[PDB]
Design a protein around this ligand. Structure first.
Ligand SMILES: [Mg+2]
Ligand SMILES: [Mg+2]
Ligand SMILES: [Mg+2]
Ligand SMILES: [Mg+2]
Ligand SMILES: [Mg+2]
Ligand SMILES: [Mg+2]
Ligand SMILES: [Mg+2]
Ligand SMILES: [Mg+2]
Ligand SMILES: [Mg+2]
Ligand SMILES: [Mg+2]
Ligand SMILES: [Mg+2]
Ligand SMILES: [Mg+2]
Ligand SMILES: [Mg+2]
Length: 121
RNA sequence: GGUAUGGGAUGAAAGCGGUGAAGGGAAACCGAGUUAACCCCUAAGCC
């Protein structure tokens, strides 16, 4: 796996992240795309950052795991950038997504954030 | 008067697009549509 993927995410945990992006897209507020996502982290707005595992070249999202740790924002890995874009509701792949307002997925992103803080070790 | 290189509508079993479309900007900022015939609006420039 790429060098920016720092920990293994179980399959059903990545599905919860995808499910959280869809629910937040419908009932809350998200940012999709690495530029919008990065700014959401720099500005302290992101409640959860979702990063695709198949980003090539890696340098597009390699800055995100360190930036999220500095800003105290949890992040989780997801296997497919195309599947992440669909979860964000766009016709194209998304290398990264940031959930700003989780909406009805607030409890879900919070269960993800706790186990992700674990997986950060 | 003609004329779009400017637009509106349309935009597919087609192309491109969050690895950033189109449009604006010196940049920051923007952040999901868009590409072309026909139809429709406009006529700076050109005839
Ligand atoms: Mg799926
Ligand atoms: Mg005329
Ligand atoms: Mg007239
Ligand atoms: Mg007239
Ligand atoms: Mg147009
Ligand atoms: Mg169709
Ligand atoms: Mg095809
Ligand atoms: Mg299409
Ligand atoms: Mg144009
Ligand atoms: Mg531009
Ligand atoms: Mg006219
Ligand atoms: Mg004229
Ligand atoms: Mg002449």
């Amino acid at each position: 796996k790429p060098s920016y993927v720092k920990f293994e995410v179980p399959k059903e945990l990545a599905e919860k992240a995808l499910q959280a992006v869809e629910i937040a897209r419908d009932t809350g507020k998200i940012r999709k795309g690495t530029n919008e996502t990065t700014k959401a982290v720099e500005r302290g707005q992101a409640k959860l950052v979702i990063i695709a595992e198949d980003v090539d070249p890696e340098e597009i999202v390699a800055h995100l795991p360190p930036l999220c740790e500095e800003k105290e924002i949890p992040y989780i890995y997801v296997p497919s950038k195309k599947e992440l874009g669909a979860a964000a509701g766009i016709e194209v792949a998304a290398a990264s997504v940031a959930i700003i307002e989780p909406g009805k997925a607030r409890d879900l992103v919070e269960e993800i954030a706790m186990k992700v803080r674990e997986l950060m070790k």
